[PDB]
Each structure stands twice: as structure tokens, then as C-alpha cells.
């Protein structure tokens, strides 16, 4: 049937003009390589989502109180049925399963609903179904809290795929990041479900702040894991033993995944370098200045790196080839602006604890302007007749 013949096999075509020999790479391989790069982050996110939920549940409840709670939620009683346990001594398998029962529904809903719009647009416009949706859907599914409603997820992916990408003509035509566009739609339409203390841990009745919401209140002294009463350390933040979005937590896993796609030449190291440069410079400037009241002024760069979605955005979503600048000189400025905006929104803006999404969405507007600035200098050099 058509579905198999277009996905599994290679088209079996030949060159009809110009270069009679072609490079082996293609969009399918590029997108699949990106898609495979987030698997470690996905699996660790599921594990952490299960572990945090189990810890919070066993902290709040015990005995018949815990039994009534588990009997009342389908995630919990399905985990119990499938052999896992909700006891405090649950192994890694039970935590992975409990994280799966949160992640998988979101991923399936996102994929199906986005693919509907993709296929509809491609059919009506007589195109061939593209491949970047595989990356879009998984990134969107990974950058949302464990407790998103499925209808909200569907609305977000609909907005991201239709308004931001398909309206402009599909893959390679848009100028904005679709996953971030959908996340921003959710962010500004339904703030109560994607912010606060109630959404980042999937334990019923549990309410607890997160790392950046705690630093803004009390500095490094306020970083405490209320579920277990221990203090969050830099190693915990780096490994990914902290609450948050599903896939953002593990900086080690994100680095392991991103190393491959940076080595392979798919992700641009220039953008990552620019992001790091901007973040380090602005964070160190704030550290030098200091402040009597704002506790965010004293967070160092190596703490900025591991908290929030900084690593995830920098590695996997600040490097979108279509949204970024097309010139090698402009890529440095693009990354620098992204890092500067992220740190600035983190430190100075009191309304939001994180700023990666807004920073990237802002830099997407000005990347073409950096491209223009570079190309105009190139044109002047040409008119000087030395180019």
C-alpha cells in the first residue's frame, strides 16, 4: 500500500540534469537523526516523572489514605495492575511505567492531531507529505508539563502546525519555530495549567515550587526538595533529579544527545557557542553588579546552565536551521541575542521564572535582519571590486 511504499523504501530515482552524482544525505535522514537524538532525554524524563510522583504521593499519604488515592486515578491503578507498585520502595521500572502513562498519551494526541492538519494541507495543495513533523511533534510533547490536558495539547499542536508552519507553505518556508509557537499559544491562553506550583509534579494534591521559582525567592539557600526534605545540589540539577517539564531536566542526557547531531553537522555549533557566550557575559555582569533585594542577581553561569529549559532549548530548539540566521557571521549574533534575552528575562522580569521560549521567539524575528546586515557589507565589498 501507499503508506509503506513512501516511508520504508527509497524512491529509486535517477538524476536527470546537472550533477549526475548526488550526496547521500537527505531530509528524511536529517529529521530521523534529530528525532533519535532526544530518546535519552525522553526516557530519563519518563523515569523522573514517575519518581517524583511516587515520592510526593508517599510523602503526603500513607495506608488506606494512599490506597484510596491510587484507586481513584487511572495512572496509579494501571501502574499497579501492570505489575508496578506505588510503594515508597518502587524500582526504576515502576517509575518508568508511571512516567510512560503520562508521556505517551500526550505524544499520541500531539502526533495524531498535528498529522491530520499536515496531511490535509498536503493533500489540498497537492504536495508530498514532509518529514519535519516527526521532530516538531516530539519536541512539543517533551516541552510540556506532565499534567497537561489532552484537549489543550491538541489545541497547542493545531496552532503550532497550522498558523506558524503550514500557512506559509510547509517545511522550509516558515520563519518561526512551530513547537515554540504552540507552547506560547498554550502559555498565553491557559496560564493556570502551564505555570505555578500545582502542575510540575504529577502527584494528586501536591503543591511545591521548582528550582528557579525558589532561587528568585531565597537564593541558593532556598533550594530544597520538599518531597524528601533534602537540599537540591548542582549534581542533582545536572543529572536531572529535579521536577520540571518532561524532557528538560537531564542536562547530561541532553548533552549526550546533542553531541551526536553537532558532530554530524546537522546542528550548528556556532549558535550554541553564541548562546553560551551571551549567557556567560550577562550573568557575570549581573553577578558583578549585585543587588540588595533581587536574589536572582547572584546566580552564577554554571547554575544558569543546569536549571530550567536552557540546555534543552539551546541544544535542540535554538538550532532550527530554518528559523536561525543563514550566514555564518549572523549565527553568532543570533545565539548571543538568544542567550542575552534568556538571562535577562530570567533575572529582571518578575512575572516569569524562565525565558528561553520567549527569547527564541524574539530572536526569530531579528535573524533575517542580521542576515541583511551581513549581506549588505558583502555587497559593498563586491562593489569595491574585491569580492
Amino acid at each position: 500500500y501507499e503508506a509503506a511504499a513512501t516511508l520504508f523504501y527509497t524512491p529509486g530515482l535517477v538524476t536527470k540534469r546537472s550533477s549526475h552524482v548526488r550526496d547521500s544525505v537527505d531530509l528524511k535522514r536529517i529529521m530521523i537523526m534529530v528525532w533519535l537524538a532526544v530518546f535519552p532525554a525522553m526516557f530519563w524524563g519518563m523515569y523522573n516523572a514517575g519518581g517524583q510522583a511516587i515520592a510526593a504521593l508517599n510523602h503526603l499519604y500513607s495506608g488506606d489514605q494512599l490506597a484510596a488515592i491510587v484507586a481513584g486515578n487511572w495512572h496509579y491503578w494501571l501502574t499497579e495492575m501492570l505489575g508496578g507498585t506505588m510503594s515508597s520502595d518502587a524500582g526504576w521500572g515502576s517509575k518508568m511505567l508511571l512516567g510512560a502513562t503520562y508521556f505517551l498519551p500526550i505524544y499520541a494526541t500531539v502526533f495524531i492531531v498535528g498529522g491530520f492538519w499536515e496531511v490535509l494541507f498536503c493533500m489540498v495543495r497537492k504536495h508530498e507529505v514532509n518529514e519535519g513533523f516527526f521532530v516538531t511533534s516530539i519536541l512539543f510533547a517533551l516541552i510540556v508539563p506532565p499534567t497537561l490536558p489532552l484537549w489543550q495539547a491538541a489545541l497547542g499542536i493545531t496552532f503550532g502546525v497550522v498558523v506558524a508552519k503550514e500557512v506559509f507553505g510547509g517545511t522550509g518556508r516558515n520563519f518561526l519555530n512551530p513547537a515554540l509557537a504552540g507552547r506560547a499559544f498554550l502559555f498565553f491562553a491557559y496560564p493556570a495549567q502551564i505555570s505555578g506550583d500545582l502542575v510540575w509534579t504529577a502527584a494528586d494534591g501536591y503543591s511545591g515550587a521548582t528550582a528557579l521559582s525558589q532561587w528568585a525567592q531565597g537564593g541558593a539557600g532556598a533550594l530544597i526538595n520538599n518531597a524528601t526534605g533534602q537540599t537540591i545540589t548542582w549534581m542533582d540539577a545536572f543529572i536531572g533529579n529535579i521536577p520540571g517539564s518532561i524532557g528538560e531536566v537531564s542536562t547530561l542526557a541532553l548533552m549526550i544527545g546533542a553531541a551526536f547531531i553537532v558532530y554530524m553537522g546537522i546542528a550548528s555549533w556556532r549558535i550554541i557557542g553564541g548562546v553560551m557566550i551571551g549567557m556567560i557575559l550577562l550573568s557575570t555582569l549581573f553577578n558583578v553588579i549585585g543587588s540588595d533585594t533581587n536574589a536572582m542577581f547572584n546566580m552564577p553561569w554554571h547554575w544558569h546552565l543546569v536549571l530550567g529549559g536552557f540546555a534543552f532549548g539551546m541544544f535542540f530548539m535554538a538550532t532550527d536551521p530554518v528559523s536561525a540566521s543563514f550566514t555564518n557571521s549572523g549565527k553568532w549574533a543570533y545565539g548571543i541575542l538568544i542567550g542575552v534575552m534568556c538571562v535577562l528575562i530570567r533575572v529582571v522580569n518578575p512575572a516569569y521564572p524562565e525565558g528561553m521560549m520567549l527569547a527564541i521567539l524574539f530572536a526569530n524575528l531579528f535573524a533575517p535582519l542580521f542576515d541583511h546586515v551581513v549581506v549588505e557589507r558583502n555587497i559593498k565589498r563586491r562593489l569595491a571590486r574585491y569580492g
Binding site: 500557512v167 506559509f168 520563519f175 533585594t293 533581587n294 529582571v348 520567549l358 533575517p368
Partner: protein
């Protein structure tokens, strides 16, 4: 000039003159076909706002504010006529013909002011300066922050549209529709700041 930069940041980002208050769209969505024109147009708007807002503040405080001319008398209903006339006069001559010194400046941005003389952005800036009890203590912070935001937004839109030549928008959505969608996305991006913690 400096009163407090939380005012400037807010007006640049969240309540942006173009992308939030919809001020100046009739030319913002039309002249943004090319970057070269938009750059000078935005610079001209910047200077006109910066000079006009404090001047209208002074005129309002000295003549049109309740009392301030004679006790028990309030001329505040002439605000619209006075503001529009002052905006028209302070440009149509006092720059259009005034800019004889600096010919390379006049041919650079002096060619764009004839279009802005009745643009709604200028009048909206003055009207905001009045509606909110600002002062010459602010003097220029608000006007400059609004003008720079307008210039930045229009230049960014022009750059985006130039980069957009590779797109394949549907025939019915070509032109005004896709421009409106792009402006909406630009505002979504621009919604990232609301204040400053020193």
C-alpha cells in the same frame, strides 16, 4: 534623560506602539515592503515623537490644563484640535523646510516626514502622555521608548517580509492576510517583557 527605565522597557515590549496598540498600521503594513525605506521612516518617527511629546506636555500644562491660564477656567476640550495642529505645524514646516543644514541628513530622513505628519502613532503617543499623568520629569523617556519600538518593529517586519520571498502562501491568503498573520506572530514574540527589578 532618565527617570526610570521600567517605563521604557514596558513601552518597548508589552504595550509596543505598533504590535500592541495597533498604532500606525495603515503604513506599517504597507511601507514594510523594503528595509531601506522603513529604516529612515522609523528614524523620522523616532525623532518626531521624541520632540513632540514633551512639547505637547508643556503646552497642555501651560494653557489647556484646568486653570493654568486663569482661575476657574478649563480649556481641556481643545486638546484634540491643539494636538493635531501642533503636530502638523511642528513637522510640515519646522522640519520639512527647516532642514537646510545637514543636506545629507535631510535627503536621508527629511524625505519621510511628509508621510508621518498625520500618522496616528504621533497623536496616540501625545494622547497617551495626556491620558496618563506624565510630566516633563519623564520629558523624553516615554516618547523615545515608543519611537524606538515603532522603528524596531517596522524594520523587523520589513526584514521578515524580505526573507519571506521563498514562501508558498495560498493564493487567497497572499498579501494582507499573511502580513496580518506575520504581525500577530511578531507581537507574540514581542510580549516578553513587562517591567524591571532594578
Amino acid at each position: 534623560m532618565e527617570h526610570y527605565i521600567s517605563l521604557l522597557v514596558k513601552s518597548i515590549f508589552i504595550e509596543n506602539m505598533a504590535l500592541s496598540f495597533f498604532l500606525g498600521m495603515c503604513t506599517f503594513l504597507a511601507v514594510s515592503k523594503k528595509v531601506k525605506t522603513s529604516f529612515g521612516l522609523g528614524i523620522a518617527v523616532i525623532v518626531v515623537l521624541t520632540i513632540s511629546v514633551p512639547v505637547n506636555n508643556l503646552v497642555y500644562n501651560l494653557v489647556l490644563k484646568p486653570d493654568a491660564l486663569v482661575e476657574g477656567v478649563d480649556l481641556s476640550f481643545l486638546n484634540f484640535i491643539t494636538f493635531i495642529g501642533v503636530i502638523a505645524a511642528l513637522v510640515q514646516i519646522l522640519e520639512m523646510i527647516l532642514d537646510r543644514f545637514f543636506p545629507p541628513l535631510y535627503n536621508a530622513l527629511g524625505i519621510f516626514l511628509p508621510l508621518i505628519t498625520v500618522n496616528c502613532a504621533i497623536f496616540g503617543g501625545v494622547s497617551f502622555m495626556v491620558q496618563r499623568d506624565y510630566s516633563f520629569a519623564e520629558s523624553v523617556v516615554y516618547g523615545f521608548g515608543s519611537g524606538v519600538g515603532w522603528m524596531l518593529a517596522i524594520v523587523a517586519l520589513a526584514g521578515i517580509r524580505e526573507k519571506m520571498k521563498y514562501s508558498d502562501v495560498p493564493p487567497g491568503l497572499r498579501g494582507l492576510g499573511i502580513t496580518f498573520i506575520t504581525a500577530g506572530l511578531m507581537a507574540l514574540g514581542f510580549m516578553s517583557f513587562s517591567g524591571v527589578q532594578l
